[PDB]
Design an enzyme around this catalytic site. Sequence first.
Site, PDB file in Angstrom:
ATOM      1  N   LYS A   1      23.696 -20.697  24.319  1.00 41.72           N
ATOM      2  CA  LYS A   1      23.112 -21.294  23.247  1.00 41.72           C
ATOM      3  C   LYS A   1      23.957 -22.381  22.650  1.00 41.72           C
ATOM      4  O   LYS A   1      25.158 -22.445  22.966  1.00 41.72           O
ATOM      5  CB  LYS A   1      22.897 -20.359  21.944  1.00 41.72           C
ATOM      6  CG  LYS A   1      22.623 -20.847  20.563  1.00 41.72           C
ATOM      7  CD  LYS A   1      21.874 -19.678  19.647  1.00 41.72           C
ATOM      8  CE  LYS A   1      23.214 -18.761  19.151  1.00 41.72           C
ATOM      9  NZ  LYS A   1      23.816 -18.955  17.832  1.00 41.72           N
TER      10      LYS A   1
ATOM     11  N   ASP B   1      20.802 -11.051   8.599  1.00 36.29           N
ATOM     12  CA  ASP B   1      19.329 -11.265   9.328  1.00 36.29           C
ATOM     13  C   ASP B   1      18.834 -10.343  10.147  1.00 36.29           C
ATOM     14  O   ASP B   1      19.255 -10.607  11.416  1.00 36.29           O
ATOM     15  CB  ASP B   1      19.617 -12.695   9.832  1.00 36.29           C
ATOM     16  CG  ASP B   1      18.037 -13.116  10.304  1.00 36.29           C
ATOM     17  OD1 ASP B   1      17.283 -13.214   9.335  1.00 36.29           O
ATOM     18  OD2 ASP B   1      17.882 -13.298  11.538  1.00 36.29           O
TER      19      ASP B   1
ATOM     20  N   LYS C   1      15.962 -23.378  14.114  1.00 37.35           N
ATOM     21  CA  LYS C   1      16.232 -24.684  13.241  1.00 37.35           C
ATOM     22  C   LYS C   1      17.499 -25.363  13.868  1.00 37.35           C
ATOM     23  O   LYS C   1      17.285 -26.522  13.807  1.00 37.35           O
ATOM     24  CB  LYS C   1      16.288 -24.510  11.954  1.00 37.35           C
ATOM     25  CG  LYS C   1      16.963 -25.699  11.055  1.00 37.35           C
ATOM     26  CD  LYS C   1      16.882 -25.262   9.834  1.00 37.35           C
ATOM     27  CE  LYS C   1      15.457 -25.262   8.923  1.00 37.35           C
ATOM     28  NZ  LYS C   1      15.697 -25.438   7.580  1.00 37.35           N
ATOM     29  N   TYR C   2      18.537 -24.734  14.365  1.00 37.64           N
ATOM     30  CA  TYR C   2      19.688 -25.308  14.801  1.00 37.64           C
ATOM     31  C   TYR C   2      20.206 -25.173  16.335  1.00 37.64           C
ATOM     32  O   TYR C   2      20.899 -25.768  16.828  1.00 37.64           O
ATOM     33  CB  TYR C   2      20.644 -24.797  13.738  1.00 37.64           C
ATOM     34  CG  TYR C   2      20.490 -23.682  12.776  1.00 37.64           C
ATOM     35  CD1 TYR C   2      21.403 -23.827  11.683  1.00 37.64           C
ATOM     36  CD2 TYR C   2      19.620 -23.119  13.077  1.00 37.64           C
ATOM     37  CE1 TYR C   2      21.311 -22.624  10.750  1.00 37.64           C
ATOM     38  CE2 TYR C   2      19.586 -21.859  12.028  1.00 37.64           C
ATOM     39  CZ  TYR C   2      20.172 -21.597  10.984  1.00 37.64           C
ATOM     40  OH  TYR C   2      20.022 -20.579  10.127  1.00 37.64           O
ATOM     41  N   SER C   3      19.522 -23.902  16.795  1.00 43.55           N
ATOM     42  CA  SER C   3      19.970 -23.616  18.106  1.00 43.55           C
ATOM     43  C   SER C   3      18.805 -23.667  19.159  1.00 43.55           C
ATOM     44  O   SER C   3      18.121 -23.116  18.654  1.00 43.55           O
ATOM     45  CB  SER C   3      20.790 -22.501  18.137  1.00 43.55           C
ATOM     46  OG  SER C   3      20.134 -21.189  17.800  1.00 43.55           O
ATOM     47  N   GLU C   4      19.130 -24.093  20.257  1.00 48.06           N
ATOM     48  CA  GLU C   4      18.073 -24.144  21.439  1.00 48.06           C
ATOM     49  C   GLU C   4      18.789 -23.106  22.239  1.00 48.06           C
ATOM     50  O   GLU C   4      19.992 -22.672  22.385  1.00 48.06           O
ATOM     51  CB  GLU C   4      18.061 -25.361  22.240  1.00 48.06           C
ATOM     52  CG  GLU C   4      16.917 -25.607  22.958  1.00 48.06           C
ATOM     53  CD  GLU C   4      15.788 -25.869  21.939  1.00 48.06           C
ATOM     54  OE1 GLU C   4      16.066 -26.797  20.946  1.00 48.06           O
ATOM     55  OE2 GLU C   4      14.533 -25.527  22.210  1.00 48.06           O
ATOM     56  N   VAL C   5      18.019 -22.022  22.829  1.00 49.55           N
ATOM     57  CA  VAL C   5      18.486 -21.092  23.815  1.00 49.55           C
ATOM     58  C   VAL C   5      17.853 -20.618  25.205  1.00 49.55           C
ATOM     59  O   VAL C   5      16.723 -20.569  25.443  1.00 49.55           O
ATOM     60  CB  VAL C   5      18.449 -19.848  22.815  1.00 49.55           C
ATOM     61  CG1 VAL C   5      19.681 -19.015  23.212  1.00 49.55           C
ATOM     62  CG2 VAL C   5      18.264 -20.120  21.380  1.00 49.55           C
TER      63      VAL C   5
ATOM     64  N   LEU D   1      15.024 -19.442  26.880  1.00 49.58           N
ATOM     65  CA  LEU D   1      14.271 -18.416  26.258  1.00 49.58           C
ATOM     66  C   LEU D   1      13.707 -18.564  24.902  1.00 49.58           C
ATOM     67  O   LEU D   1      12.710 -18.469  24.703  1.00 49.58           O
ATOM     68  CB  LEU D   1      15.513 -17.264  26.072  1.00 49.58           C
ATOM     69  CG  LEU D   1      16.651 -17.251  27.099  1.00 49.58           C
ATOM     70  CD1 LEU D   1      17.466 -15.796  26.877  1.00 49.58           C
ATOM     71  CD2 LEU D   1      16.303 -17.032  28.540  1.00 49.58           C
ATOM     72  N   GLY D   2      14.677 -19.526  24.203  1.00 53.70           N
ATOM     73  CA  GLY D   2      14.103 -19.701  22.825  1.00 53.70           C
ATOM     74  C   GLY D   2      15.053 -20.897  22.018  1.00 53.70           C
ATOM     75  O   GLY D   2      15.636 -21.818  22.758  1.00 53.70           O
TER      76      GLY D   2
HETATM   77  C1  LIG Z   1      17.541 -16.643  21.090  1.00 50.40           C
HETATM   78  C2  LIG Z   1      17.009 -15.254  20.253  1.00 50.40           C
HETATM   79  C3  LIG Z   1      16.844 -15.983  18.919  1.00 50.40           C
HETATM   80  N1  LIG Z   1      15.722 -14.709  20.646  1.00 50.40           N
HETATM   81  C4  LIG Z   1      15.298 -14.290  21.905  1.00 50.40           C
HETATM   82  C5  LIG Z   1      13.986 -14.820  22.308  1.00 50.40           C
HETATM   83  C6  LIG Z   1      13.406 -14.585  23.394  1.00 50.40           C
HETATM   84  C7  LIG Z   1      14.236 -13.848  24.700  1.00 50.40           C
HETATM   85  C8  LIG Z   1      14.117 -13.579  25.822  1.00 50.40           C
HETATM   86  N2  LIG Z   1      15.245 -12.975  26.327  1.00 50.40           N
HETATM   87  N3  LIG Z   1      16.138 -12.901  25.272  1.00 50.40           N
HETATM   88  C9  LIG Z   1      17.414 -12.637  25.502  1.00 50.40           C
HETATM   89  C10 LIG Z   1      17.884 -11.988  26.569  1.00 50.40           C
HETATM   90  N4  LIG Z   1      19.214 -12.003  26.769  1.00 50.40           N
HETATM   91  C11 LIG Z   1      20.153 -12.205  25.874  1.00 50.40           C
HETATM   92  C12 LIG Z   1      19.593 -13.059  24.741  1.00 50.40           C
HETATM   93  N5  LIG Z   1      20.366 -13.690  23.974  1.00 50.40           N
HETATM   94  C13 LIG Z   1      21.854 -13.691  23.607  1.00 50.40           C
HETATM   95  C14 LIG Z   1      22.176 -13.871  22.409  1.00 50.40           C
HETATM   96  C15 LIG Z   1      21.182 -14.625  21.969  1.00 50.40           C
HETATM   97  C16 LIG Z   1      21.145 -15.427  20.751  1.00 50.40           C
HETATM   98  C17 LIG Z   1      22.188 -15.194  19.631  1.00 50.40           C
HETATM   99  O1  LIG Z   1      22.632 -14.000  19.585  1.00 50.40           O
HETATM  100  O2  LIG Z   1      22.411 -15.987  18.581  1.00 50.40           O
HETATM  101  C18 LIG Z   1      20.023 -14.335  22.703  1.00 50.40           C
HETATM  102  N6  LIG Z   1      18.399 -13.384  24.634  1.00 50.40           N
HETATM  103  C19 LIG Z   1      15.479 -13.552  24.190  1.00 50.40           C
HETATM  104  C20 LIG Z   1      16.087 -14.060  22.891  1.00 50.40           C
END
Ligand SMILES: CC(C)Nc1ccc2cnn(-c3cncc(-n4ccc(CC(=O)O)c4)n3)c2c1
Length: 334
Positions: A69, A157, A50-54, A46-47
């Site tokens: 992540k 944040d 700077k420190y985490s890939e997701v 998804l994304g």
């Molecule tokens: C990854 C974040 C930065 N942005 C992002 C960008 C595009 C997308 C698309 N869907 N999506 C998404 C959907 N479900 C859960 C999470 N998720 C659950 C925890 C975290 C990350 C966390 O809680 O640290 C993210 N992210 C995104 C989320």
Amino acid sequence: MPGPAAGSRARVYAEVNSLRSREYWDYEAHVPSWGNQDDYQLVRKLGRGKYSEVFEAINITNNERVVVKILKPVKKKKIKREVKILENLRGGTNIIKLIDTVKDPVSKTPALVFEYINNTDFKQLYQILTDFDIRFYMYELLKALDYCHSKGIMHRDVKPHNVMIDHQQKKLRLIDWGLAEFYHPAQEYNVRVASRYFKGPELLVDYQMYDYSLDMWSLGCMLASMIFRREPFFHGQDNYDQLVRIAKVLGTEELYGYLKKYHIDLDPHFNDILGQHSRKRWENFIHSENRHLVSPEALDLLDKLLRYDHQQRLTAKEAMEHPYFYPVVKEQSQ
Ligand SMILES: CC(C)Nc1ccc2cnn(-c3cncc(-n4ccc(CC(=O)O)c4)n3)c2c1
């Protein structure tokens, strides 16, 4: 040093953590357990930052869609902590749910397995909204803020990219918590946190004695953009222009008073930068383009949020007991 400065304190949960077991806030002493990755198949990324890939993944063991992540051991500290905090949040309304802390023997590095919510990016989303579909998420969002605030924690944040929203179903989850931290009665806190569009005014004068309040300015910023139509509302340049972009709204004078209120010598520069601007009626932003979203409420609530005195702002809860949100008999009627 010649020219002392009072300081601040949380006006709401100013002493919460204290009246609590150290175990709790002592995350530098929090050794969580871990799991393999193997149980998880990372489907689509998804994304990442700077420190985490997701990525988007699903638990191999039980074909359950989930989000994961990862992030190199930058500072086992941040990591250590980010974890304690989240466990310490789990079961919190609109608070991203931490499924389980696992270390993908992949690299033999730790990762988080968060619940999965179908986000739709505010970009497209923040335009189909409605006076209702806004008060609705704000309030929702708030329920989250007040909760973590109530639990001695200030996310640190707030911004669209951290506020998923399943508009189809209709849910909100303030994802992420990697920059958050614990709030103890007075403690110079790095000011280098947040984003160049929400970072509160307070975090510009490099004023560390901040608190939960910070979580509100941000929350303030979104609302405005959400209500007026500007993204970001204070679309700043230099980490310094970001102070003027504001100055033109809250006021140049009104500003000093603030830095007077807390003994604060405005770094040079801003001199050439700032200028003499005077508080602008928030109506000075309501045109056809957004006419239907505004209203005295939002303007009201909005003024009490986007304020310089990082103290005289509405609280996380007060916000909810505010009028603008009345349109919501907050499914709970008792
Ligand atoms: C990854 C974040 C930065 N942005 C992002 C960008 C595009 C997308 C698309 N869907 N999506 C998404 C959907 N479900 C859960 C999470 N998720 C659950 C925890 C975290 C990350 C966390 O809680 O640290 C993210 N992210 C995104 C989320």
